[PDB]
Amino acid sequence: RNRATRVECTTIVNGVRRSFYVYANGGKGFCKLHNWNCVNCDTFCAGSTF
Amino acid sequence: FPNTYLEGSVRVVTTFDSEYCRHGTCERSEAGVCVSTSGRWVLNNDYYRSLPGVFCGVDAVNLLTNMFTPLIQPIGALDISASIVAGGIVAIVVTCLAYY
Amino acid sequence: WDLTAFGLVAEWFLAYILFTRFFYVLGLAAIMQLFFSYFAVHFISNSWLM
Amino acid sequence: FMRFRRAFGEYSHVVAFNTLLFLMSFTVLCLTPVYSFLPGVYSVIYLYLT
């Protein structure tokens, strides 16, 4: 259904609301361990799902 | 072995309170009177007053009164012989009501 | 030769492939039938409804 | 089949009655191995009802 690569979300730091993205696979696999479209979710390299 | 009042196809046995035994195994039986429609072995002990065709009681009148014990039992105690028990009540009920 | 058991196994495999919400009630019926066939006798007394 | 159907009604009055007697006799025969005095009295009551 969704081919999105980034997902938006917000959090509060020092009384202000910032924003950041969460990366996703984009259409391949399902990763039933945490039921999210992840890309190589075992390495702390840049661009990986966290 | 206990005393036998009759012998043959119909057997009547009266027993005291003792471990009557013969060739094979031994069991304890209470004092009383037992009767069976077959020539099979009979005792006043438990597991003996469960088999079909076997009647038992403390005395002669007690056995006769206890012969009707399954009649007041809730339904689901007999499997094959239920038909004759049902008929023996049905005939009495239908006569005593519909005529008298 | 005979291969009825293999056919039944294939049928079960194809059923598991076509998963739905109602597979669990069929599995429960099968396991209950197996359990009742395996022990029976012991806990059935009176209660013609049972 | 129509001729047989038309002819059957004459003997149907006995055919229907025979079934209950056959069922009772079969039940008595089935109950024989436990109460080995039933066949004697059953014959007498059978003759009485005859």
Add this chain to the structure above:
Amino acid sequence: FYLTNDVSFLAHIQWMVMFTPLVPFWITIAYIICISTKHFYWFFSNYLKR
């Protein structure tokens, strides 16, 4: 007796399901005979009577 057949059938079914396991056998057999006399009369008249 003082009810319509439509509710009478449900009443008989409910009574037979509920009160059966805790009632003496002769009460049940009398209930069955009283229920089935109305059809026994018809059957006897139409297939056995003379």
Add this chain to the structure above:
Amino acid sequence: WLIINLVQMAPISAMVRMYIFFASFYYVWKSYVHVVDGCNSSTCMMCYK
């Protein structure tokens, strides 16, 4: 009386065997789940990684 009837339903050996049956089925189902979906402790790398 209901509790008394329940506890005296069957002999001890039958109860043990019936418990064994259900325990075996539960463990088999848990093993089957562990086979396909993966374990939480991926750090040990188990054998599926």
